[PDB]
Amino acid sequence: MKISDGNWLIQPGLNLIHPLQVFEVEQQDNEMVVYAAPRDVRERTWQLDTPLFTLRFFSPQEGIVGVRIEHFQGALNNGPHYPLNILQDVKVTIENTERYAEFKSGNLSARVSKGEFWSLDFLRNGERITGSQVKNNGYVQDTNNQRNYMFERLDLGVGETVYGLGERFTALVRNGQTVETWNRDGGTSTEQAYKNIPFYMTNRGYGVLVNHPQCVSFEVGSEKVSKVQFSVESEYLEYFVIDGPTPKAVLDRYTRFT
Amino acid sequence: MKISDGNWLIQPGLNLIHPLQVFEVEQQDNEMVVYAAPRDVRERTWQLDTPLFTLRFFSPQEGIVGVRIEHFQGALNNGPHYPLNILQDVKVTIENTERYAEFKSGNLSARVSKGEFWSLDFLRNGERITGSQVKNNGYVQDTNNQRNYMFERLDLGVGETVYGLGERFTALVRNGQTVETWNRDGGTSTEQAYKNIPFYMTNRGYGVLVNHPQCVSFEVGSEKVSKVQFSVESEYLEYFVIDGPTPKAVLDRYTRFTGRPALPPAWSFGLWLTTSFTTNYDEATVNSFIDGMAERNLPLHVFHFDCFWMKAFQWCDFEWDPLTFPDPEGMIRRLKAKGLKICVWINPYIGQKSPVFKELQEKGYLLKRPDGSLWQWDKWQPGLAIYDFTNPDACKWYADKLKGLVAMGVDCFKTDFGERIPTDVQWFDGSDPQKMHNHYAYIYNELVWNVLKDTVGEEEAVLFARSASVGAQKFPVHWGGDCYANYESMAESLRGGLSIGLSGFGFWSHDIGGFENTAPAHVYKRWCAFGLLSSHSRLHGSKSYRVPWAYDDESCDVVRFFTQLKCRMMPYLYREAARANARGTPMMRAMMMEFPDDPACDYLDRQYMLGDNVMVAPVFTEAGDVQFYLPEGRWTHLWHNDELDGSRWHKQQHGFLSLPVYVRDNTLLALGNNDQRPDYVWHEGTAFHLFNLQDGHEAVCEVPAADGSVIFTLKAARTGNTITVTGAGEAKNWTLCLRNVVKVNGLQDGSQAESEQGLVVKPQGNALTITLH
Amino acid sequence: MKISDGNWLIQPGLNLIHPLQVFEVEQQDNEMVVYAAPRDVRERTWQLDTPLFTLRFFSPQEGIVGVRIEHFQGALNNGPHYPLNILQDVKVTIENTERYAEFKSGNLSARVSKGEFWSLDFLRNGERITGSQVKNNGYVQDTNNQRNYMFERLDLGVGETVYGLGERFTALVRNGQTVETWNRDGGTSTEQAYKNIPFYMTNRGYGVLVNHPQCVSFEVGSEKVSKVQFSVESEYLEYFVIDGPTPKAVLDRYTRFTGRPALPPAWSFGLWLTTSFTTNYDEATVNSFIDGMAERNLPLHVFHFDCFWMKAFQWCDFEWDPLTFPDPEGMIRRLKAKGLKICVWINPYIGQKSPVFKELQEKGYLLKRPDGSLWQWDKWQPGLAIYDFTNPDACKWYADKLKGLVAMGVDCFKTDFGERIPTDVQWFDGSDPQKMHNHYAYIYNELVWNVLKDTVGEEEAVLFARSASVGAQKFPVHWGGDCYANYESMAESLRGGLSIGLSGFGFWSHDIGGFENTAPAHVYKRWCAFGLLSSHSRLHGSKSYRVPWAYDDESCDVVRFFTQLKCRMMPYLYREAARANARGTPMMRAMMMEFPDDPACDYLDRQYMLGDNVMVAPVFTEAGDVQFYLPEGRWTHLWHNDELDGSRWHKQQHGFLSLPVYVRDNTLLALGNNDQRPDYVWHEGTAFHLFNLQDGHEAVCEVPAADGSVIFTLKAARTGNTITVTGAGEAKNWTLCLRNVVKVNGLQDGSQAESEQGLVVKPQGNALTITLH
């Protein structure tokens, strides 16, 4: 789904808001909650008449980090939900410091930068394998058709290629393609697929499951050419980053999980 | 809402039908029903294929005539409805004659003219005070948006002026205005109002209540220049004409009908101070300001904790911020032990960040959209939701939190917000969201009032309330809202103040210096004098404490001087407050309300009467220039003692310790012997003051008890050069000052002594008679 | 137009941008240009991807500052434009400093603050009188209807009241009102106006013209309660602040800028009578009514032929109905022989039934829709079309028809209608239809005026005009429209008349008893006194003849009395008429205009000053009760001679031959010796009346010639008990009455004789001196 209109502009009638500053972090047993404002709220005068994002970090399985970013919790959110294998007892580390908020399962951590320069980074033993740069996630209010979406864009490195997203008949490497995860009877010669899966992996040895059974719209280097963008009509977005560090290892964790 | 398009045309797309001819009149017990056709139906051939209006006339209270004009009765018509006091057995007269149908309650009748020349006239002892002329009421079918309305236009006479319609900040006299009775959060600087009331009164000595909680659209001399037009989206229109013949008489009837103002506790009449808003609060900080007041001999009676007693983005979840307030109950006890009363900020919304939010969502206590999702937005607080006060279990949850605060020693609450109540929702009880928008403010404030009434007791109950609706005057005090720190803004605030008392509210607070964090010192000083010569008085800023020593030593002298003055004025002030409770007479009165027969008073909005006997005119310039009007009589300055004759305008220059505060002639006024607190035993140590007692007149002074009942009455009567003084009830060690009288010929039954303000007589025996020169 | 949604929000769908920071100032000869960014542009990284406002300050006349604020210059911006008198060499001062840029003309300046705190201030001798605060002007992008606007909001101070905006019938003080400047035919009872003008003035001694002939939307304290907001659908906004410091001084500069009232001929001040609307006119019928007047000694000066001089459904084709009017010129010349001037009805529309309609259609002289078809409807006349006065041949055709009537003996015209000008059209000259809607009133009247200038001569030119736009005050007299016959309607009319004067119009006529066929006699009689104590005065009915003997004998007496009075008053009245021509001071003045420093006068609307020296308060009750305010001084009834002390309200009761008509103290008034016609040699036989001349004052009386110039001046000066009278110029056989002075100590150079009003003194030698007892 088109969100940006090139580097400098936004599609007409979309109003965007982004998590841009950590307001507070709270550890809740084996989960980490980051409240992030869409503007500077260091001063109490500005700590009102503003939206606020609630990000929750959690681990369903060792080496998998779940990330739920929420605008409104008041939505209905009926099922069905995917048949995920979710443990409550995974061993994790949560480190909340002046500089960062960090949540680690196995060798994989999610790290958020506090202060002026927001960043969401996914690290493997402390080296960045992907992440989200400021203003590349958030909420889309489409004033054209009255629908609202949540989105994310996860970075791709130099030479990083994307795979999966179901049984598809387009070019194998997904870079340059938009993909809608929506089952269709379209034969074997089109962009359509009978077997859609909102899961991709890369040649950097991680994968990602976007945890929504509805249509998920991927712009796989097709809007921002060095990022995998994904968006869903929802008040929350939930995705899982899955460590490898090889493709087979991702697949081992993915299939344990799902 | 525009119906006509000038005299000659109608707005495009609107079809109008009017009651044009009486077909039939029926008496139904103590009610009169009139069937009225939209065309000539005198012939049987026209007695079909036509609409017909059904008009019912009834009286809920003496001198109130209700008029209900209906098209279709099969409409749903859900509540809520206004909390009206409706009697079933009011004595009425119904006469149905060949020329007229007439319904009479007290001195007020409604008369409908039979035959070819339709007329609806409101009469007072048979003299027309207003009415509806043919084609000025009926039904509007809007074929543009498929909505249907009922409307009326009640006539205004030559020079007739309109007041009220809630606390509003527009020009005081309403002629030329459109007003929509719809609560909004728009500040104190616009056509919007937090406190809308579909009631107006005029300088002809009657009032009208349009009985619809939904939005009522008034065109007050703004469509038809000599009528008050009102319209509502409904199959019926119901309004009540309320006789006077004086403004105070109208409000007495209006407040008996819709609710009497409660009498607030005497402590509430002192000086309130707050933490300010976006400053930083903690016990040390709070105490530095409290001690600062005391160090400077600046009396302080109530202290208020503002929003940040709770965590940011979690308002209002009732959880004390634990960093800032590690021992909330201990802190408040330590303040109470100083003699202070405690207020905290509340509102009826809740931010999604609060840990309690999830609990409320699971229990169903938050307002829902029709699909069952929560109604939410990001104004005020992120993911804000509204407490569903139509859900009894939600009311109980909320009340229990308030009870937990009271149990910790909190004495009162600021019932903030309540205006921005959405309509695209489904209330727990299934009520009409159009009507719930405004009535929410009543239910919210009633809930909070009742917590106090069930805990501290009714005598101790008081709020500072931002929003209101019909009936909410029963839950004082109403607070004028957020202001800029400038003289224009101070002026529009006083218009709001006068207006709310013109709409049934007996008490009105406001914030000295406004809210804007930097006031110039001169504005703050002028506004202190106004603020402390108002029923209720608060200091509250935005980003810093509103303490006088932020400005200069002189601002401290101003705060001290007027705080002392108000405390000493309390035996007078509290008696005048009991009038608000008994008769709905507000403490702050528009000049037109106190002097209804004086044509110089119709538009006066920069001065007021504070009770029966004192005119106050705030000063709206740095230099101290002020112009004001005095009605007939020889007035005396409350502490300067200079005199002025009335029935004319005056121009003066006042320094920051002064303003025009003029006491009427033939007045006996009680000042007390405590200038440090408002709540003390007024009838001991009482200093009475007699001002310009003319021959043939009598001045009465009633000193109240703590409960507002009259504990002592003193009377001074003059015949020739002898004034006879008689007291009845309980009082000790009092004295009578003969203002501006330096010498007396003689005195029976008392001693005498010189004072700067005149002879001070001390009684012994009661003739207390004094003989003038 | 609503822009904000309370203090805190914006109306849904509107995107606002404001000038917030000076980027650069440039002097261009006698003009100051300010470039103003809507965001911080101090760093070069922000000096792109931003709008920029262009503000230009300039002076068309001394004491007027023009302010042009522009977004895009690439818009078409077609005419018409208002008929502004623009000088290019006004002495101005331009100052550009680190802190401010300031543009000054006379005592008036616009100053723009540089740096962080944008402000636009209008200063009089350096003291701020009004201004625009940051974010109170700018550009509105309406995203709901794709229209764009510009807006400004100019501050009001404490107690600052707003006046004017054309002839309007709402409450006189405009605070609280929305007003749209868009000519309409809406009657005289609504918020609509035939005569709209986007100029207002305040009780702070300045005024502002919004220089847009399209609809201008004013929220006069109705959105922001202490600002006058105005918007227009345009890529620029231009307005002019006009200094006083007095109301009269503002109107002086205003009328120099946009046009001076012409001086109507003295005959025009007589009594006008009409055929009435639907009477069956014919020579005999007309003469019988004119004879009825003469037979009852009711002076009569002008007779008007209404619509039915032409054939039904063919108005306005200029053809005399041949069955009714077989010999038009013969008739009119017979009427004139009786000492009458002749007016005829005209308008700028034509019915399809007229033979002439096809002529005009074929010549292209009628307003077309964009597809070339004629614009037509069936309002007023069936298949009514409009004369396209942007077509020079159409204007010539119409003027020639007018020249034909004048050649026949017609003296003047009632220029009726002109309001309902559609915009879904293509004008011959391609003008902006949105601007032509109002400006048509001007072109229409200008053309008719010039026919008169070109025939009967400029000095003899007069109209009764129903519509107006800016400039059209040059083409007097303006006529207040269709009124219902009741006291409320009467009072509405007076507000409209007072309002037009406060909008640059020096003369105002209206119909006695209104238009509606059956007024009660009491109303007709009250209205008669009011009508004849106005500049211009007419009797005109609907179905009914407006002759007083219809009612009762007393109606004839009332007419006679007040017509005699007005005629006797002409020496006074015509001198005051010249003030309207010289300075734009209207004859009928709002009390606040004459007494700007008296705060009692701010809202007074049921009384007025008729020239400098006389207060009239019409009586708006049958019984005769009337309450009025008098400014400071000892006032004298003009013929009852009773005296009243001022600075206070009074209550009186008057019969039908009376109302409050009070003469100011220290006044010398000229009364004439003819009570039968207004046009005579006022300076022969003059009766001067001197009213309450105080020690150390002087009273001046200027007697005009027929051209309004002063032909004689009389002065009376008192020092001690000596009054010294000095005459200069040409007078003959005049006298001086010492009102309420029965006896004097002595007289040098004069003789004395008793009279019931006071001593009448005749001069000889003019070292005339009176010594008081």
Ligand SMILES: O=[N+]([O-])c1ccc(O[C@@H]2O[C@H](CS[C@H]3OC[C@@H](O)[C@H](O)[C@H]3O)[C@@H](O)[C@H](O)[C@H]2O)cc1
């Ligand atoms: O001074 N500030 O730092 C400030 C910040 C936000 C503000 O926003 C506005 O607060 C307004 C009023 S503030 C309110 O709550 C705090 C108390 O201190 C006040 O006395 C009370 O009226 C709200 O009504 C508006 O809806 C909201 O937009 C106002 C002021």
Ligand SMILES: O=[N+]([O-])c1ccc(O[C@@H]2O[C@H](CS[C@H]3OC[C@@H](O)[C@H](O)[C@H]3O)[C@@H](O)[C@H](O)[C@H]2O)cc1
């Ligand atoms: O870092 N900045 O100072 C900066 C500011 C605004 C900017 O705005 C964008 O500049 C863009 C690129 S800048 C262009 O002009 C200046 C040259 O120095 C560049 O090389 C050229 O590409 C424009 O194409 C966009 O339409 C405009 O929105 C860009 C950079």
